[PDB]
Amino acid sequence: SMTEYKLVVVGAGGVGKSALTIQLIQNHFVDEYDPTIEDSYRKQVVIDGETCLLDILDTAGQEEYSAMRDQYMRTGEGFLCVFAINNTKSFEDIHHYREQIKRVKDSEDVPMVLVGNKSDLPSRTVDTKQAQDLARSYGIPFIETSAKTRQRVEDAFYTLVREIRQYRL
Numbered sequence: 001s002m003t004e005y006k007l008v009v010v011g012a013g014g015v016g017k018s019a020l021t022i023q024l025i026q027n028h029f030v031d032e033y034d035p036t037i038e039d040s041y042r043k044q045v046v047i048d049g050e051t052c053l054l055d056i057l058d059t060a061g062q063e064e065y066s067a068m069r070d071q072y073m074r075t076g077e078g079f080l081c082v083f084a085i086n087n088t089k090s091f092e093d094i095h096h097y098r099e100q101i102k103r104v105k106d107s108e109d110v111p112m113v114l115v116g117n118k119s120d121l122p123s124r125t126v127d128t129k130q131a132q133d134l135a136r137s138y139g140i141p142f143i144e145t146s147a148k149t150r151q152r153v154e155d156a157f158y159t160l161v162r163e164i165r166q167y168r169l
């Protein structure tokens with residue numbers, strides 16, 4: 001029987017949560033995917049020789065209090081906190097997603113990876129060192145990815161699974 005990893009992809013609308021998830025599932029870049037769709041995406045994978053199932057929740061903006069967001073935060077075992085390297089505001093929002101997860105879990109240590117998406121884009125606004133420094137302060141990995149060219153997409157999810165395994169082992 002296969003271990004199922006419940007992963008949640010969080011971050012400001014338009015950073016590429018859906019593109020990243022679809023890239024992992026379908027090996028395809030979507031130019032557009034309806035920004036209001038919050039749904040689960042499953043994939044059977046082998047990570048470091050572990051045959052397992054990834055149950056990935058790709059999330060939507062919710063401006064006010066959301067009982068269902070709280071419940072996914074309670075349920076999720078690992079979180080990809082995604083910003084876009086060309087969007088400073090999405091980077092600044094990261095701290096708010098991390099705080100919310102921690103408050104819901106009532107825990108300062110929760111499996112998480114920081115993801116800087118759209119690494120293919122030549123015009124960056126968020127310095128790598130700045131993002132790396134933040135990750136260091138949180139004690140989590142930092143990966144730069146491109147849903148468009150597939151750069152580090154597997155790496156980002158697989159790293160998160162590694163973070164979940166190590167929390168336990």
Ligand SMILES: N[C@H]1CC[C@@H](N2CCCCC[n+]3c(sc4c(Cl)ccc(O)c43)NS(=O)(=O)c3ccc(O)c(c3)C2=O)CC1
Pocket residue numbers: 006007008037038039040041055056057068069071072073075076077
């Ligand atoms: N797009 C439509 C159909 C799905 C629906 N939806 C989101 C999918 C819920 C998937 C079950 N689930 C969860 S949590 C969760 C996690 Cl942490 C990881 C992987 C999961 O599959 C998962 N189900 S749940 O009851 O907490 C939940 C939370 C938020 C939601 O938007 C929904 C369900 C939901 O209604 C939203 C409307």
Ligand SMILES: Nc1nc2c(ncn2[C@@H]2O[C@H](COP(=O)(O)OP(=O)(O)O)[C@@H](O)[C@H]2O)c(=O)[nH]1
Pocket residue numbers: 012013014015016017018019020030031032033034035117118119120121145146147148149
């Ligand atoms: N250039 C580039 N664009 C991307 C990347 N990921 C997403 N996008 C685009 O950014 C926009 C928002 O992506 P989407 O996946 O819907 O983000 P979500 O709201 O966070 O789900 C869409 O136009 C995507 O095509 C990437 O790695 N590189």
Ligand SMILES: [Mg+2]
Pocket residue numbers: 017018019033034035036037058059060
């Ligand atoms: Mg989306």
